[PDB]
């Protein structure tokens, strides 16, 4: 049924956001409301639409200036906080750009400040010729037309290409709105503005993977072994110009349907490219995904050679971890998709029971997926807040929590270990080897002498 937590007695609208799955229910009657307004003052985990555009998607690219039009805080705040390596020395993580908006630009406008900043950025790094410009709260409010500025810069500097995103933090309710705005602008403006050489009979885009700790590079080893050309990765270890070529692919493979389903859906509508949803986390899931790709292309034997080798290499280790992790209780408090990519994969492949899940910004679609794959007796929370997290801990007593570092550091005080469900501990976590890496971190987190030591009060005789 829907649950009114004690901590929510004074915000009882939260009951419609929390489902405890019980036997024999028709889950269609219990779908959390999601993707609705935040309650002020709650200590919701949510962030802003600018985050979803710049930090999560656009900022992943290896060769692109990330020009944040606004005061310096939005830039500072999105720098040294992600783990998406590249194969060019991590340009994406080393730098962030701001227009350093001041009071006089609020009064008189920021367009010339932006334009000047843009030219400076291209002058300071003459080998970089690609840029994304983002709005932030105040530059939205004052009406700066960043698309027009970008047009003018491109006219004046014909060797550059600039994309713009309107994503002030008050737009939408969460980071989700930033994903949408970016995805639709990109397809509308920049797809089919260039072409690349095709070098294989089998071509795909991989859509919705952001190369966390090298996930994308690990999966690329699969595609290379299968002889599949990836026209574009959206956006892990990607380039701006690869993303202009997305119309060329034969197939779109989607992992993050939440952040990047929009572009897959428009590529199908406009170009006829089919959308194939897979789970690129999970051992058995990865095998299913590979078999689907290879069935689409007609390379099923190659897929079976790859899968056999990967199971030979990794399955014994996986199984060793399952033997030790069987029955442990897990909570997942992350953005949304990882709830439905992990709940049954950790259960199948590791014997782990997911007892509570919270999604910061998932939509009703994400809840449909997670509830379909998740267990009875589990709590499913939309837009969870910190007091809820404590109450849920008391209810379900997890052995391990997969969540962000700050929450990890909170629940440590309760003697509950964490794995970073966002940026990983020791990743990558995608693919066959990756799920072994996930299992290893879960094992070390829980099989940890410190946890036992912490419980001992030395004053007791």
């Amino acid at each position: 049924p829907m649950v009114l937590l004690e901590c929510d007695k004074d915000i009882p609208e939260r009951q419609k956001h929390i489902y405890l799955k019980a036997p024999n229910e028709d889950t269609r009657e219990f779908l959390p409301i999601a993707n609705a307004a935040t309650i002020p003052g709650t200590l919701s985990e949510r962030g802003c639409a600018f985050c979803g555009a710049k930090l999560v998607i656009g900022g992943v690219l290896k060769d692109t200036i990330q020009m944040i039009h606004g005061p310096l805080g939005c830039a500072y705040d999105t720098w040294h906080t992600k783990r998406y390596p590249t194969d060019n020395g991590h340009f994406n993580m080393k730098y962030v750009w701001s227009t350093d908006m001041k009071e006089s630009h609020v009064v008189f406008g920021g367009e010339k400040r932006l334009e000047k900043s843009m030219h400076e950025a291209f002058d300071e790094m003459p080998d970089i010729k690609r840029m994304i410009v983002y709005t932030t709260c105040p530059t939205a409010l004052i009406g700066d037309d960043i698309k027009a500025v970008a047009k003018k810069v491109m006219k004046d500097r014909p060797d550059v290409d600039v994309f713009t995103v309107e994503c002030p933090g008050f737009s939408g309710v969460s980071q989700s709105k930033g994903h949408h705005v970016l995805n639709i602008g990109w397809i509308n403006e920049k797809v089919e503005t260039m072409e690349k050489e095709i070098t294989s009979e089998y071509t795909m885009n991989f859509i919705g993977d952001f190369n966390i700790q090298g996930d994308t590079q690990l999966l690329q080893t699969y595609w290379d072994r299968l002889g599949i050309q990836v026209v574009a990765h959206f956006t892990g270890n990607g380039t701006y110009d690869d993303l202009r070529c997305m119309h060329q692919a034969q197939l779109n493979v989607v992992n993050c349907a939440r952040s990047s389903g929009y572009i897959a859906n428009e590529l199908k509508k406009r170009y006829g490219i089919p959308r194939l949803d897979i789970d690129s986390w999970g051992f058995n899931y990865m095998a299913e995904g590979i078999r689907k790709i290879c069935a689409f292309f007609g390379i099923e034997e190659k897929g079976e050679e790859l899968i056999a080798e990967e199971y030979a290499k990794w399955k014994p280790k996986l199984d060793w971890y399952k033997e030790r992790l069987q029955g442990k209780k897990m909570a997942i408090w992350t953005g949304g998709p990882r709830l439905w990519h992990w709940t049954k994969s950790v259960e199948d492949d590791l014997g782990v029971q997911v007892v509570a899940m919270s999604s910061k910004f998932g939509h009703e679609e994400d809840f449909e997926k997670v509830i379909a794959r998740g267990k009875e007796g589990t709590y499913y929370i939309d837009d969870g807040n910190e007091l809820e997290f404590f109450e849920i801990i008391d209810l379900v007593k997890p052995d391990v929590i997969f969540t962000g570092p700050r929450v990890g550091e909170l629940v440590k005080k309760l003697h509950i270990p964490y794995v970073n469900g966002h940026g990983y501990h020791n990743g990558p976590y995608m693919g066959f080897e990756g799920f072994v890496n996930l299992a290893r971190d879960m094992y070390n987190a829980v099989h940890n002498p410190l946890r036992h030591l912490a419980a001992v009060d030395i004053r007791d005789k």
Binding site: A37, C48, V173, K413
Partner: protein, 464 residues
């Protein structure tokens, strides 16, 4: 010998040195016991700053958002403030203080924070009759200043709010101390110094318990120790000792103007002389002697530093970046140990003030080489100068400059805020005698490792 100040020559920023004002206001507020700041603006202005604190401290701190969404941006966001205060009060029964911190959004739209405060005060008085919550308006538009300025503004506003409510009472006998934006280890050191000198003092804010234990009983102790009572007692102090011109002196000044508590601003106590001068001012205002234990700690520092200065530090060129009080103080420390701080970077628009700082002349009368001080600096300014041929032996700064040092193959000591890429630095003092020693030894040890990795006379680390 020239100390030259110059501004950044670009309009844009690449690699900002500091965060915006509201982030600093949040840092002020999290040092208060039974305080949850409420950041009036979009959600990122809260959550990204809670992450930044977790990076520096490896701890959670509670800060809430008003969750400004599209409708408030068209019609105003007062109702989000008002709801957020109530939702806090209702769910956190022990909450006492809520700094209401504005952002770029809510400064631009002109929400009337004081008006919302009056509404909330009425509501709270009716709903919770035997409770007092102090709502402090904190105006921190992000399009001026920095997190340094925001920190100072929040401290001042909270102090104004709580002292307005309580007034002057009976003399406390104590000092007020505003150390500025320092680490838990710096607070621990200061408490020791006042204890050894038999001086009663409140340190504002007292952040020692930010380094909280993992305890057998699972209790959470990750809180500021500064209470409402402590703040209100500031009115009754003997004097205020302000250690940071840009990080709390203006609160000392407010207390002097309002309550006739005399404020004494001293150089921030980085290095030996600045520490000496702090302790002498404490002795002057309290009439208490400097204890033999401090002479000894000083002497132990000096002994350690003397094993390093002319052997390893002399003629080595240093760049320093960070908060202004820290950059100026560290430059003075460096000279005491024969380092040459040739490039000082200070990261915000307060150059009109910095050009008047008495420490600039102090640096001019002690330097044996030219110093460039770039104000309104970003960290690209450091990288660019190295790319153009500036030869540095050492960088001192916070962790968001790490790739500059890594790529240039220059040893770097982590100082200031945030220092997330090394372990435990929050617990190590930087100020005082022990801090000077610990800084110097960090510098040497970073040089020593660099000599080994680079095979640069690594054999020499035997009989120094």
């Amino acid at each position: 010998a020239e100390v030259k100040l110059s501004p950044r020559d670009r309009e844009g920023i690449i690699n900002p040195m500091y965060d915006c004002q509201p982030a600093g206001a949040q840092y002020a507020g999290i040092g208060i016991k039974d305080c949850i700041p409420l950041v009036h603006g979009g959600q990122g202005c809260t959550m990204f700053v809670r992450l930044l604190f977790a990076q520096h401290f490896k701890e959670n701190f509670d800060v809430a958002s008003t969750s400004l969404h599209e409708e408030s941006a068209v019609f105003g966001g007062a109702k989000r403030v008002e709801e957020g205060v109530l939702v806090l009060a209702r769910r956190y029964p022990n909450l006492r203080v809520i700094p209401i911190i504005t952002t770029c959004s809510t400064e631009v739209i002109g929400d009337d924070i004081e008006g919302s405060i009056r509404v909330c005060n009425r509501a709270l008085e009716a709903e919770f009759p035997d409770r007092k919550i102090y709502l402090a308006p904190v105006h921190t538009p992000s399009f001026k200043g920095s997190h340094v300025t925001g920190y100072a503004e929040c401290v001042k506003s909270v102090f104004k709010t709580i002292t307005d409510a309580h007034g002057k009472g009976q003399p406390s006998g104590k000092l007020n101390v505003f150390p500025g934006w320092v680490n838990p280890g710096d607070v621990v050191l200061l408490k020791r110094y006042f204890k050894e000198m038999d001086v009663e003092a409140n340190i504002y804010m007292d952040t020692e318990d930010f380094d909280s234990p993992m305890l057998p009983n699972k209790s959470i102790e990750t809180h500021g120790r500064t209470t409402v009572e402590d703040i209100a007692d500031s009115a009754n102090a003997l004097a205020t000792l302000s250690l940071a011109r840009y990080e709390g002196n203006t609160t000392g000044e407010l207390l002097q103007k309002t309550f006739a508590v005399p404020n004494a601003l001293v150089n921030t106590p980085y290095g030996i002389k600045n520490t000496d001068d702090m302790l002498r001012k404490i002795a002057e205002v309290t009439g208490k002697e400097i204890p033999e234990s401090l002479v000894r700690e000083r002497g132990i520092a000096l002994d350690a530093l003397a094993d390093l200065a002319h052997m390893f530090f002399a003629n080595k060129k240093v760049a320093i970046f960070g908060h202004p009080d820290l950059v100026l103080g560290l430059a003075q420390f460096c000279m005491e140990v024969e380092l040459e701080p040739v490039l000082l970077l200070i990261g915000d628009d307060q150059g009109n003030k910095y050009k008047k700082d008495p420490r600039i002349e102090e640096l001019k009368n002690t330097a044996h080489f030219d110093i460039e001080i770039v104000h309104n600096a970003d960290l690209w300014e450091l990288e660019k100068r190295i790319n153009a041929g500036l030869q540095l032996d050492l960088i001192m700064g916070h962790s968001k400059g790490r790739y500059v040092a890594i790529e240039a193959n220059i040893p770097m000591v982590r100082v200031g805020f945030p220092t997330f890429d090394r372990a435990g630095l929050y617990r190590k003092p930087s100020i005082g005698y022990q801090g000077a020693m610990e800084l110097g030894e960090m510098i040497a040890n970073a040089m020593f490792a660099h000599m080994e990795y680079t095979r640069n006379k690594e054999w020499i680390l035997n009989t120094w």
